[PDB]
Design a binder for these strands. Structure first.
Length: 205
DNA sequence: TTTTTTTTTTTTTTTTTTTTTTTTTTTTTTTTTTTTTTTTTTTTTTTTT
């Protein structure tokens, strides 16, 4: 869907191929930067798949771009600081391949703590062995495979969404005073869900 | 003692600079030598009383 979206998998990517490389300009004394996945996705989405299997030496590059939205090159004869204003959309398998609901999120994935902290939302997709959802998923899959173009009745064209989203990204909402007060109150509630007595949460607020 | 991540570390090159090596290249004057003149110093056939 997204323009300016890169897809990448766990081990198939290097570090120079993930952030940036430098090659010599054969026409002049200049230097040309070879953009990587985290830079083609600038002001877009970098979908990293198989995130847990992605090398620690490359997790460092990912973490640098996640935490400071920039990539710095000091190679081959140039220093160049580059913009990496990507948003990361990652998928990660749990350790053992399955999510143990008896352990925290930290104990289930082998992501480094700095990486996990640079994530706004963690969506756990547990496979419940539920017969009714098995039925619903089966109907959806079999219907898609029966009526390919049909069974896709989206209220908005996907180009329409692309235009709408591009337009809306120009808006810079402000925070009202009552929104400020509501934010502090909801943050107080969110913190309170993490105290003693009640059941432990997957990760702390 | 079966599985597993950092560690090199030998091998591909590529860069890449610095240094040593390589490659390219007729024209133009001058001068001696020969063969000519040319003024001058003889010198060898002309004649008289």
């Amino acid at each position: 869907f997204s323009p300016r979206a890169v897809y990448t998998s766990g081990k198939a990517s290097s570090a120079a191929g993930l952030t940036a490389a430098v090659v010599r300009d054969e026409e002049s004394h200049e230097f040309v930067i070879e953009a990587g996945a985290l830079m083609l996705a600038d002001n877009g989405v970098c979908c990293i798949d198989e995130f847990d299997k992605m090398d620690v030496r490359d997790q460092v590059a990912i973490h640098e771009a996640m935490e400071q939205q920039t990539i710095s090159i000091t190679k081959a004869g140039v220093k160049a600081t580059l913009n990496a204003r990507t948003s990361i959309l990652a998928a990660a398998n749990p350790i053992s391949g399955h999510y143990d609901r008896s352990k925290s999120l930290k104990q289930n994935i082998n992501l480094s703590a700095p990486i996990m902290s640079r994530f706004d939302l963690f969506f756990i997709l547990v496979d419940e062995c539920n017969e009714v959802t098995d039925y619903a998923i089966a109907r959806r899959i079999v219907d898609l495979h029966s009526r390919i173009e049909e069974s896709i009745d989206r209220v908005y064209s996907l180009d329409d969404i692309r235009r709408y989203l591009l337009f809306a990204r120009q808006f810079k909402p402000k925070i009202s005073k009552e929104s400020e007060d509501f934010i502090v109150e909801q943050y107080k509630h969110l913190r309170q869900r993490d105290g003693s007595g009640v059941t432990k949460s997957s990760w702390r607020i």
